[PDB]
Amino acid sequence: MSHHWGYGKHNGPEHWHKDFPIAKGERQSPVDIDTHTAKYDPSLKPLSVSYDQATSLRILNNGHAFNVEFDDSQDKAVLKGGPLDGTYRLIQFHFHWGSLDGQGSEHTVDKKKYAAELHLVHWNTKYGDFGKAVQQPDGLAVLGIFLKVGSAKPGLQKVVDVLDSIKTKGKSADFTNFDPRGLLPESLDYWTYPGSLTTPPLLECVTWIVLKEPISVSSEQVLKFRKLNFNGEGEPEELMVDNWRPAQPLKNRQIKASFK
Ligand SMILES: NC(N)=NC1=[SH]CC(CSCC/C(N)=N/S(N)(=O)=O)=N1
Ligand SMILES: [Zn+2]
């Protein structure tokens, strides 16, 4: 029980396959996005991001990241279009980030690593609930957005300022009326490919949609991410940093671009 997966030397990504053999599967994520090789697919549609009726509820430190959770019991905040067939409901978002500004993203672009990566996780409403959706090859759609360090992202600050209250694993806080539209870049140009969850159980249920344009966050904003703890309250401090899985083999997949 006590030797659980994580991001350390003894329980990190190179160990995950022992408990989760799908870690060596045929459609694992993340991947490197080779820009010159990705092919423009003129049949891909614009993404439809409809977040105006989003109902955020709570923010949780789960010991690996923090999740901002949404009410997904109705079609409030939904992702449609692009490569997707049907309607995908937003359930949560979270980030992956580094100990230094030169690492932290899960996807890479021509081997470049960004400081962090935002994942907005959505599930296909034809499967009725999230737990059923993760058992399907087209069950989830994760919208990935890169973060670089530069100017502050004003729409991120409300997240940053609540992190002191969920420092340690298992802590949560009310987090209502947060508008995830404030985390998007200007352009919705994207790459897409079939992949997996990037944490155990690593299920091969995700249509990945990775935006081309990064958002900028300030050094102070990402420094606050790095003050979070992997540990629970009253345990030795382990800073929550480098909670990213490295790029996995592309195998028999093609990455498609929505743009020329
Ligand atoms: N609840 C339920 N029935 N199953 C599962 S499997 C993983 C999980 C937690 S959310 C799925 C993990 C995730 N979003 N990975 S990522 N980094 O976005 O690719 N719940
Ligand atoms: Zn993620």
- The DSSP-derived string for the chain is --S---SSTTTSTTTGGGT-GGGGSSS-S--EE-TTTSEE-TTPPPEEEE-TT--EEEEEE-SSSEEEEE--SSSSSEEEETT--S-EEEEEEEEEE-SSTT---SSEETTBPPSEEEEEEEEEGGGSSHHHHTTSTTSEEEEEEEEEESS--GGGHHHHHHGGGG-STT-EEE--S--GGGG--S---EEEEEE--SSTT--S-EEEEEESSPEEE-HHHHHHHTT-BSSPTTS---B-----PPP----S---EES--
Phi and psi at residue 56, to the nearest 5°? -75, 150
Cβ pair 4, 12 in contact under 8 A:
no
Residue whose CA is at the smallest distance from ligand 1 atom 3: 131
Beta-carbon contacts of 104 under 8 Å, excluding residues fewer than 6 positions away, are 96, 97, 98, 113, 114, 115, 116, 117, 147, 242, 244
Numbered residues of the known binding site for Zn(2+): 94, 96, 119
The residue from 3, 64, 107, 122 that is catalytic is: 64
Residue whose CA is at the smallest distance from ligand 1 atom 1: 131
Nearest to 31 by CA among 202, 215, 257, 245: 245
Parent domain of 165: 1-260
CA dihedral 176, 197, 80, 68 (to 10 degrees): 10
List, in sequence order, every residue forming a beta bridge with 96; answer none if it has no partner.
117
- CATH number of the CATH domain containing 149: 3.10.200.10
Burial of 135 (0-12, 13-18, 19+ CB in 10 A): exposed
Ligand 1 geometric centre to CA of 121 (Å) = 8
CA dihedral 152, 118, 213, 149 (to 10 degrees): 30
C-alpha dihedral sign at 209, 215, 220, 221 = negative
Can you tell me which atom of ligand 1 is nearest the CA of 131?
3
Numbered residues of the known binding site for substrate: 198-199
Please state the domain count of the chain.
Answer: 1
Cβ pair 233, 171 in contact under 8 A:
yes
- CA atoms of 72 and 91, how far apart (whole Å): 6
The reply to whether 4 belongs to the active site is no
- CA atoms of 97 and 116, how far apart (whole Å): 4
* Residue 99 vs residues 12, 133, 162, 199, 251: alpha-carbon distances, Å: 15, 33, 20, 19, 29
Q: CB 39: neighbour CB atoms within 10 A? A: 8
- CA atoms of 196 and 214, how far apart (whole Å): 22
Q: CB 243: neighbour CB atoms within 10 A? A: 25
Can you tell me which atom of ligand 1 is nearest the CA of 201?
6
* Residue 247 vs residues 2, 26, 145, 226: alpha-carbon distances, Å: 27, 13, 16, 22
Beta-carbon contacts of 140 under 8 Å, excluding residues fewer than 6 positions away, are 88, 121, 122, 123, 124, 133, 134, 197, 205, 206, 207
Nearest to 221 by CA among 87, 94, 113, 116: 116
To which residue do tokens 């990213």 refer?
Answer: 244
* Residue 65 vs residues 46, 61, 98: alpha-carbon distances, Å: 30, 6, 12
Residue whose CA is at the smallest distance from ligand 1 atom 8: 201
